[model samples]
Target: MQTVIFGRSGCPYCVRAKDLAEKLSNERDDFQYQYVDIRAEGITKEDLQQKAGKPVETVPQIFVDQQHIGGYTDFAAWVKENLDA
Candidate 1:
């Protein structure tokens, strides 16, 4: 599976999310992880809303194989459940 983490720099939650992704990737080589800084480019809140189909104006939006996996807590749960399974 492909894991993509959308976040900006200096975000604690984003940092935590990336850490989790890295841990998961280290354990499973089958997963591909990538990080995208929304503020680096012209990625606006509207763009994120359109991509997530919700008004998620927060940092650390995670995607698992093009599917929204929510924030850090959700991602952590997924790692414990699906990835560990």
Candidate 2:
């Protein structure tokens, strides 16, 4: 599965989220992660909203297999529940 992490620099949650994803990737080679720096790359709010299907005014919005996984909390739970399966 393809995992896309949209985040900005200096975001602690973003860092943690990416680290977790990398760890998962290391354990299971079935996933690949792509980090998108929204701020540096000029990704507007509209773009984020479009991708999220809602107005997520927060940083570090993650998508797994093209499906929105909310933020870090959601991702962590998903990883625990599904990634092991």
Candidate 3:
């Protein structure tokens, strides 16, 4: 599984999301992760919202293999439902 996390610097949820993904990648060779800093990359929240197809009110927008996966809480739920042992 490949995960991509779009986040801004200094956001806690973003940090948590990336940390979880990093642990997953370290533990599972089949899993890989990437973190993109929206501000650093010059991506606006509006652009992310358009990609997400929903109102994005928070940082740490996540995706899996190009599929939108919502925010931090949603990402945690996704891990619980799909990635958990």
Candidate 4:
């Protein structure tokens, strides 16, 4: 599986997400990850809201294989539950 992390700079949670990504990259050869800095590429909040199908109230709108997986906490839970094997 692959994780797509949509986040920006200056967010501590985003930093955590990327750190987790680094850990995963070291641990799992089958797993892939990507980080997208929304503002860095002109992606607006509205665009993220549309993709998430909900309000974009925070940074780090994360996804797994194009499935919305929520913020850092949710992403962590997903990894623990799904990738711990």
Candidate 4 local lDDT, 16-70, one digit each (tens): 8888876888777788998888778777667777787655467767878898888
Model 2, backbone clash pairs (residues 3+ apart or across chains), number: 0
lDDT on C-alpha atoms for all candidate structures: 0.80, 0.82, 0.80, 0.79
Q: Candidate 3: misplaced stretches above 4 Å?
A: none
- lDDT (Cα, tens digit) per residue for candidate 2, span 26-71: 8779989988887777877677777786454578778899988887
lDDT of 4: 0.79
Off by over 4 Å in 1: 55-57
Scored by lDDT, model 2 comes in at 0.82
The alpha-carbon RMSD values of the candidates against the true structure, listed in the order shown, are 1.5, 1.6, 1.6, 1.6
Each prediction's TM-score versus the true structure: 0.86, 0.86, 0.86, 0.85
Q: List the residue pairs that clash in candidate 3.
A: none
For 1-85, candidate 3 gives per-residue lDDT tens digits of 8988898657888889888888778666788888799778887667887788656376768888888888888888887778775
lDDT of 3: 0.80
**Model 1 lDDT, residue 64, Cα:** 89
Off by over 4 Å in 4: none
